[PDB]
Design a protein around this ligand. Structure first.
Ligand code: PLM
Length: 283
């Protein structure tokens, strides 16, 4: 008789079905712009965010989700009837949140808690959350859900292109960003999430048009051996996203092609004009 709660954070891109789940708890990630604190969905929209960021004197800054809030929810979970909790948070490679909460797994009597490192964010992370609920609805036990998540995590990644590397370098998430930035200004680098969940240069490509072709070739090879969802994700780049989506459809790549967007949390770090292809097994 497992009664399961699922946690994630607002860096995940969540479907309408998932957002309505009664056992889902989402931790907000605040964004500070020139000293003013915003939380998307409370006092900020994604459209407003890109206008504020373009106007701001300094780059926005994100903060980790609140460990105090997570504790507040976990402390009430037993009294709500829960026996298990699964936390699917943004990659340990892009935020210190994951490491800072590891103490919690044995801190709540009567609750079995697991925090797998997802090594991702955005739409693949939201698909992991949705998958957990679908597997639970299919009758999987806790250990089986953990195993299926591990399979997804092992075969999930994303390939990214940005208009301005300043957000990734000054925000600190591009591996070695400050040391390598000088050599990236004359080309269009393709970034990716490596096997440690860290954003790093995958390939240097001389033109944006050749980089776009490489994105398609990469996704074709990484998803060729099984059933994958591919997501075209953009931050204020809807024309480029539609072109990339159509290209994947013209060549029959992936078992599922969809669109998503970057809001305040990830747009702070990628900047406007960003595009990514994420992929994750269907299971
Ligand atoms: C499918 C992946 C698409 C590309 C994802 C790019 C992510 C860029 C880095 C985002 C870091 C956000 C950190 C928020 C919490 C914190 O400040 O610690």
């Amino acid at each position: 008789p497992m009664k399961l709660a699922v946690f994630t954070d607002s860096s995940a891109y969540l479907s309408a079905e998932t957002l309505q789940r009664e056992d889902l708890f989402v931790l907000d990630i605040p964004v500070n712009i020139d000293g003013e604190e915003y939380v998307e969905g409370i006092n900020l929209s994604a459209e407003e965010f890109y206008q504020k960021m373009a106007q701001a004197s300094e780059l926005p800054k994100t903060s980790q989700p609140s460990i105090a809030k997570l504790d507040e929810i976990l402390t009430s979970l037993k009294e709500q009837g829960y026996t298990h909790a699964l936390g699917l948070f943004l990659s340990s490679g892009i935020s210190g949140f994951y490491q800072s909460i590891q103490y919690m797994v044995d801190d709540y009597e009567g609750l079995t808690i697991a925090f797998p490192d997802t090594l991702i964010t955005s739409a693949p992370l939201g698909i992991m959350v949705e998958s957990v609920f679908n597997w639970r609805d299919q009758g999987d036990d806790f250990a089986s859900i953990q195993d299926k998540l591990a399979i997804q995590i092992s075969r999930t990644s994303a390939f990214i292109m940005v208009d301005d590397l300043d957000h990734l370098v000054k925000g600190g998430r591009l591996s070695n960003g400050a040391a390598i930035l000088g050599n990236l200004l004359s080309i269009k680098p393709i970034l990716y999430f490596n096997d440690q969940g860290v954003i790093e240069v995958y390939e240097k490509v001389r033109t944006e048009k050749k980089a776009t072709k490489r994105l398609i070739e990469i996704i074709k090879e990484t998803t060729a051996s099984g059933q994958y969802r591919v997501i075209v994700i953009h931050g204020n780049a809807p024309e480029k996203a539609e072109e990339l989506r159509q290209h994947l459809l013209d060549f029959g790549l992936g078992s599922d092609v969809s669109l998503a967007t970057f809001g305040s949390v990830i747009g702070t770090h990628l900047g406007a004009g960003s595009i990514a292809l994420g992929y994750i097994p269907v299971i």
